[PDB]
Design a protein around this nucleic acid. Sequence first.
RNA 1: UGGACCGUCGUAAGACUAACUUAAGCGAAAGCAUUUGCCAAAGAUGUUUUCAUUAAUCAAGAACGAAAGUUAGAGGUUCGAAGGCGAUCAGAUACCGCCCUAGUUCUAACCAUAAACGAUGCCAGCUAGCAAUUGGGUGUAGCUACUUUUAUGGCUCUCUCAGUCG
Lengths: 91, 152, 62, 220, 84, 107, 134
Amino acid sequence: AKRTKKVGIVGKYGTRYGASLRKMVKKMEITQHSKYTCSFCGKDSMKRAVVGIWSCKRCKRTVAGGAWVYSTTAAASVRSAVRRLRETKEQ
Amino acid sequence: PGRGAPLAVVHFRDPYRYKIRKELFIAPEGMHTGQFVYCGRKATLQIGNVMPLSQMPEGTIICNLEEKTGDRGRLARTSGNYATVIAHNQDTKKTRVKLPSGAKKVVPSANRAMVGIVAGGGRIDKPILKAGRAYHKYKVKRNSWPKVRGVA
Amino acid sequence: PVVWARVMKVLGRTGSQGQCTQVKVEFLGEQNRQIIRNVKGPVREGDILTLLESEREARRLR
Amino acid sequence: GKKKVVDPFSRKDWYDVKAPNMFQTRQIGKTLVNRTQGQRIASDYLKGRVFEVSLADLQKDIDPERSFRKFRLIAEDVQDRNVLCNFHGMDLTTDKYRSMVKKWQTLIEAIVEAKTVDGYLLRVFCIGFTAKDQQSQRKTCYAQQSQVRKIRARMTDIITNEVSGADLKQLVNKLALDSIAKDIEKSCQRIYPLHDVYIRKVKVLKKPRFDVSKLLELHG
Amino acid sequence: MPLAKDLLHPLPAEEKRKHKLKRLVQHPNSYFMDVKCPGCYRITTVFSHAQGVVVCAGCATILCQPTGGRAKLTEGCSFRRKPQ
Amino acid sequence: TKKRRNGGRNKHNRGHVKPVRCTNCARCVPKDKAIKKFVIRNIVEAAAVRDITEASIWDSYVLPKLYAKLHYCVSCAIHSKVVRNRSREARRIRTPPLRSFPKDMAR
Amino acid sequence: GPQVRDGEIVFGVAHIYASFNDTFVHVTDLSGRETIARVTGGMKVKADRDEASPYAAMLAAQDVAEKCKTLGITALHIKLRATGGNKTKTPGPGAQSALRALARSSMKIGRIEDVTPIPSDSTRRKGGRRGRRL
RNA sequence: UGGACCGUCGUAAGACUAACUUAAGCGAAAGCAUUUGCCAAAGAUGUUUUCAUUAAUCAAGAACGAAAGUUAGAGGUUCGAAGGCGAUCAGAUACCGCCCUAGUUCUAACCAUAAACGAUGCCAGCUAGCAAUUGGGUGUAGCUACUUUUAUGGCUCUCUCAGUCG
């Protein structure tokens, strides 16, 4: 059945710490230690080690990224920001 | 353990000796292992290479900024921030920069930095939530107290 | 402040409490200035009149 | 403070202004510059002077009709109270500007930046208007958003023929008659009838260097 | 007349400009033509509003003009309004 | 108590559209239902025209005028006698009348 | 031959500014830096209301014409400011009257323009959606 | 007090994208105006394409709804409830001023109501003109444009559907 009714994965940490502090770790741990499509290994084998340090478990590529998702939307924007700008200096 | 940030383990072949020489950077964003880094004034801009300020225009972001050219990067490397430069000046080789303070100050230009945002953020937005994790948050950073107020 | 202004054409007034003839007058040495001045009191057509303020006439459109 | 008892304008001295060579004669008046001191050097305050003149002053327009072409100038260096007074832009006055827009129209606006033969970076502001065809009672004469955007593409390749187009020693002579304002009609009329059209402002945002060798030739 | 007595027998030319659909029977304005491209000789039948690029097996001169309406070829066409 | 037929102005197949404020009240109103007088007013107000012809450098310079489309709200129109108070029937025309002279305030 | 007349022929800038509640007579260099005869109508009548009067504009136009001739300025150019953004955008009543005492002083002048600030797009007035209820 | 406001260049800075703006248009409605590229999607005419009733509308229900308004995280310009102060008034706690404060800003979501109005639900049919105008077609037995009489192109007339306004 729908086991809990709202909280999901923070349900370990119940009746504690407050209302909208039980919620703020929900929105930041339904992403963390879920599995991601690897940009290189192609499969879905992404777990964490510590803050911002992901590795695969298959084909052993390890990539530094965001710290609660695989890479933040702050990050690829920069990876897009230096992308368009690089063709402007030497050309 | 003692950071929040991740490091970066990398090595080089010496222009002068015969051996490999191992160093440790601060992690630029997107650093997969097996990435081919580059370190030079002629090294073209791509994240996360390391290049001096005189060969990149304004509008780029960097990390591991050096103030004094030779002292190898003592500015703005910690988790979830980004070294910026918004000013070039060809008069006496000057480039103004904005630190993550917001107070924007002046550095010289021949110094080096690593292009891109630096990995780790944001470890203020997950509340540590108990008095056992923020024991271990100060297990190995310093030994403050779990601090004790004044008025008792 | 010593020029004298002669009348050519007459128009009405914002009269009620200070009837003052908003009236078309020109000078003699400055006869090319047909500035539409404002004289208090009855004035016949054809009368040369003295003047000290020779700058404007506080125009309202009519 | 300073407490000058009489005439601060006594130290303000009459300094002449001199045009470039290719337009007309050079005396278009004076400027009032304070007298110098040892640390107060009046020559270096002339570099902070931006100057203004029209084409009527530089193409003998006796009845002012082509005086809408207003030229921005920059005072750059002096000798014997005679500034060289380099070009710094060529705008349009608001008189010729706002008179054109009788509503009943679709304007044709285009903004383009380019690098010249020299090190300048010009900013061209192509502004167009639609011409009413004859025998027409319809009071719109409108363009339909491809009738502008292709015409917007029609001028941007025209103007870059002239950015590699024999610069300010020769470029403003093409702007004196505005031959660039002539030939664009014959390209536009293949698509749409073009009304009055101008560039209305230029900008000099990347004056690279002084380059006094050709510039004394410009002050010839 | 708005109160007309004959609708079975209308005048022909106004029906020719009425619509492709709203007539007394159903037939479009479209037809088939037999275009010979002027740089070549080969016979080719094609629709009026063909909506499709056509060339011959060996004679690809013009044969069409791409449009939403009828293929309006200026000085590059020779055909007839005729079932072949 | 509906008096206008369509209502204000120009709300055919759109909904709710662009506003800009009035100049003499700045009750911020939509661009359709606000009175939009447009005027090419002259600079010297037709009185110093004979004086500038004597003081001109050139042959009369011949004088330009100003162009700016001003925007009025409703009470701004009635508290300056712009447009007011036709009949229950005489509110049914837009395009006429002036009929007499080339209109002043330009002039 | 090519003989321009002595007597320091120059064209200054008026920068005549007018408004409701003020009129400004701010003459400067043709380049625009050095400013001569800054004085205006606000130093003419001590009433705090009559500084929009064309009379005070005339007194602001009486004095400024002759001090051009103290340094030999005989001609100038005329610019107009509104100074409206989301504000007035139209010249006050004392604007057209201010040039008259300049015109009726035998000052030979032809250039009449506005640098009345026409913005690209408005940046919000004051009063807020129901402004100035009289 | 000596340097405001003023003139002037210049540095940023964030909001807004006026004019052109319409009794224009697109959208299902809210809403929706810089260029240009991109990635799409819809409507309309075009169609001697295909399909074979796949339909209309709809309880329960699922997407969307400007602000106002909250939940952490940005960034701060104009402005700005609230709060102070000057007038005005008999009182003003207001209509007017001066200052800034919530916030409008853009990212992540969350309520889901407005006079959310054309105070009129949606789809089928007929019944009246007249005049505008949007697109698409079509006929010029039209001019104009010069690349040349042409050609693509513009306008004008004619016809046409979807209309929508009057």
